[PDB]
Amino acid sequence: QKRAKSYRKQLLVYSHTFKFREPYQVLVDNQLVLECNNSNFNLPSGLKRTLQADVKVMITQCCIQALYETRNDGAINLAKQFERRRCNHSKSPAECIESVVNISGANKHRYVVASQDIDLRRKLRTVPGVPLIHLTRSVMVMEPLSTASAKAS
User: Which of 116, 115, 98 minimizes the C-alpha distance to 106?
Assistant: 98
**DSSP letter, residue 114:** E
17 touches its own copies by CB under 8 A: yes
Q: Shortest distance, CB of residue 92 to its own copies, whole angstroms?
A: 21
Does 136 help bind its own copies (rule: CB under 8 A)?
Answer: yes
Strands 55-60 and 24-28: parallel
Single out the segment in contact with its own copies by CB under 8 A; choices: 59-67, 76-84, 90-98, 124-132: 124-132
Is 138 a binding residue for its own copies by CB under 8 A? The answer is yes
Return the residue of 22, 23, 49, 108 that touches its own copies, per CB under 8 A: 49
Q: Which of 94, 125, 146, 129 is nearest to 24 (CA)?
A: 129
Q: How many CB atoms lie within 10 A of CB 134?
A: 16
d(CA 103, CA 126): 12
Establish if 44 lies at the interface with its own copies (CB under 8 A). no
Q: Choose the one of its own copies, Zn ion, none that binds residue 23, judging by a C-beta under 5 to 8 angstroms depending on kind.
A: none
Sign of CA dihedral 148, 150, 151, 153: positive
If one asks whether residue 135 binds its own copies (CB under 8 A), the answer comes out as yes
Binding site for Zn ion (CB under 5 A): 60, 62, 87, 89, 96
Q: Which residues form the interface with its own copies (CB under 8 A)?
A: 3, 7, 10, 13-14, 17-18, 38-41, 46-47, 49-51, 121, 125-153
